[PDB]
Paper text:
The main enzyme responsible for degrading the bulk of PAR chains is poly(ADP-ribose)glycohydrolase (PARG), which hydrolyses the acetal bond within the ADP-ribose polymer, but cannot reverse the protein-ribose linkage. We further show that while Drosophila lacks ARH3, there is a striking evolutionary adaptation of dParg that confers functional equivalency to both human PARG and ARH3. The dParg structure is composed of a central macrodomain fold that harbours the predicted substrate binding cleft as well as the catalytic residues. The macrodomain is extended by a highly structured and conserved accessory domain so that the overall domain is composed of a twisted, mixed, ten-stranded β-sheet flanked by two predominantly α-helical sub-domains.
Residue numbers in the entry: 26 to 525, 533 to 547
């Protein structure tokens, strides 16, 4: 009758309006929080913060650094060592009228990759997908705006951009405007030292950021991601007339890194599972129906996954409809097992249809989501990376159930004085990545019970699973089942599977029935 089972959405918000409960404290500058704009925000967009630039192992190597030098071959075949930022400016201010000339300009400061990079998805989009006039508008309007924005980087970033490395709790806050500039540079593949595919290299524990690998990819989902990105730049680049369309606010990136001190012993959790306000919806999406909640990103340990590539499932889609997330790739070291990344403030610019191979851009989206005191849209996303399984049976090992419990734990912790809003999630690391929906739902319930967060769970058209999970929360509620007690049952199922989906839930019935 209704799409959903369990408690209502009013309930998930603790009967207060969405957005009254916040997911992150306000931005303030500190030892553990670098802020790229001036506090407090008076004018908009925020005014950039000024401090000496850094070209070192602790900060982003910015394309405009005076330390960035580059060899050029010449007309006549000799070598000049020049400043790469000067070469980038010269290349991008030559006229560029075709897809081939764009590729040659980008390659002119990436000459190592001359015979490896071919921007086939860009050729497909401009030569075959758009008609002659939409393509003329690309070269006469859009691309000049992207270049002009990229070339303002020394004006918009006047402060070193720190890397968020392994095992450090740190935050970084930037303006949406600053992010549009960094992303324009990525679009034009300007970031130094971030292209090599060599196995052990300076940045190999970091994601890719230059957009070349997207351009090298194929198929319809890749073009639709390109359309999302184009659209973002139409939305946020100043037009020839004015700059009133430029976004006004802020985005914050928080590396959460758990200490041994924070590790839950799951057999000592007396938390009642049925006391979790659980809302299980078979329609709806996290980005729409989960407004006000901590929304989950079914992440790869490299933030963004294959968004610059062939990837086009849950993570990748979020990163092209809310492209400000992409800048996380620039400074976020890959996640270790007891770490997570919270991203607050990312505006949505695109609508979409489908999923995976059927993903399509389906139009403009005007985000009216309210901004917090710090100038951030109150869209809070946590990146947590599930394990992938070649073998489904492997996931029922005790150590790898604990791993996932602890991964979701560090993603979902609150660590603020005000009460935590609900989490909005779903079949995390399931489908083709090997995970069991039935188990991953319980692990997430355990974590929410333990932390005291409501849980809004989306099954995406699967009514059967909605019911099996609702019914199993009812058995917990009136048996007063407990985290440690469900852990005990789950460890039993571990040793059972060893000696050799729908059957996990059958055997809790059994171990529960005896109580
Ligand atoms: C209501 C709805 C949405 C969708 C499409 N979709 C999807 O198919 N999957 C995979 C699965 C399909 N059927 C299953 C039983 S799983 C999704 O995982 C999915 C996820 C989202 S989301 O996470 O809310 N948002 C994004 C993409 C921004 C992060 C949305 C649609 C999904 N379906 C079938 N039914
Ligand atoms: Cl030159």
């Amino acid at each position: 009758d209704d799409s959903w089972r369990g408690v209502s959405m009013e309930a998930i918000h603790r009967n207060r309006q969405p957005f009254e409960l916040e997911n992150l404290p306000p931005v303030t500058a500190g030892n553990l929080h670098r802020v790229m704009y001036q506090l407090p925000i008076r004018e908009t967009p925020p005014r950039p913060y000024k401090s000496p630039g850094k070209w070192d192992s602790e900060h982003v190597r910015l394309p405009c650094a005076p330390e960035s030098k580059y060899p050029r071959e010449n007309p006549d075949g000799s070598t000049t060592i020049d400043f790469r930022w000067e070469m980038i400016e010269r290349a991008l201010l030559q006229p560029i009228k075709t897809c081939e000339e764009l590729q040659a300009a980008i390659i002119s400061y990436n000459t190592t990759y001359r015979d490896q990079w071919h921007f086939r998805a860009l050729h497909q989009l401009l030569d075959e997908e758009l008609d002659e006039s939409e393509t003329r508008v690309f070269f006469e309007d859009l691309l000049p705006r992207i270049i002009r924005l990229a070339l303002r980087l020394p004006d918009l970033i006047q402060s070193p951009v720190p890397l968020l490395k392994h095992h450090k709790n740190a935050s970084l806050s930037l303006s949406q405007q600053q992010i549009s500039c960094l992303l324009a540079n990525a679009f034009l593949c300007t970031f130094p030292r971030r292209n090599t595919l060599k196995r052990k290299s300076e940045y190999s524990t970091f994601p890719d950021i230059n957009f070349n690998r997207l351009y090298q990819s194929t198929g319809p989902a890749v073009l639709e991601k390109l359309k999302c990105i184009m659209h973002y730049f139409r939305r946020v680049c100043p037009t020839e007339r004015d700059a009133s369309n430029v976004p006004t606010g802020v985005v914050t990136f928080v590396r959460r890194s758990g200490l041994p001190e924070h590790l839950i012993d799951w057999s000592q959790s007396a938390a009642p599972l049925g006391d979790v306000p659980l809302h299980v919806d078979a329609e709806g999406t996290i980005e729409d129906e989960g407004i006000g909640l901590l929304q989950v990103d079914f992440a790869n340990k490299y933030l963004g996954g294959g968004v610059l590539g062939h990837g086009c499932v849950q993570e990748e889609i979020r990163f092209v409809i809310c492209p400000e997330l992409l800048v996380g790739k620039l400074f976020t070291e890959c996640l270790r097992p007891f770490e997570a990344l919270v991203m607050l403030g990312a505006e949505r610019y695109s609508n979409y249809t489908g999923y995976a191979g059927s993903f399509e851009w389906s139009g403009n989206f005007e985000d009216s989501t309210p901004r917090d005191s710090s100038g951030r849209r109150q869209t809070a996303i946590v990146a947590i990376d599930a394990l992938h399984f070649a073998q489904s049976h492997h996931q029922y090992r005790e150590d790898l159930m604990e791993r996932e419990l602890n991964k979701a734990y560090i993603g979902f912790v609150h660590w603020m004085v005000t009460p935590p809003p609900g989490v909005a999630t779903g079949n995390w690391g399931c489908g083709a990545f090997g995970g069991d929906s039935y188990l991953k739902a319980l692990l997430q319930l355990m974590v929410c019970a333990q932390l005291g967060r409501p849980l809004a769970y989306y099954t995406f058209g699967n009514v059967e699973f909605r019911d099996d999970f609702h019914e199993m929360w009812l058995l917990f509620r009136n048996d007063g089942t407990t985290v440690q007690q469900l852990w005990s049952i789950l460890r039993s199922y571990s040793r059972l599977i060893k000696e050799k989906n729908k059957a996990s839930k059958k055997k809790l019935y059994d171990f529960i029935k005896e109580e």
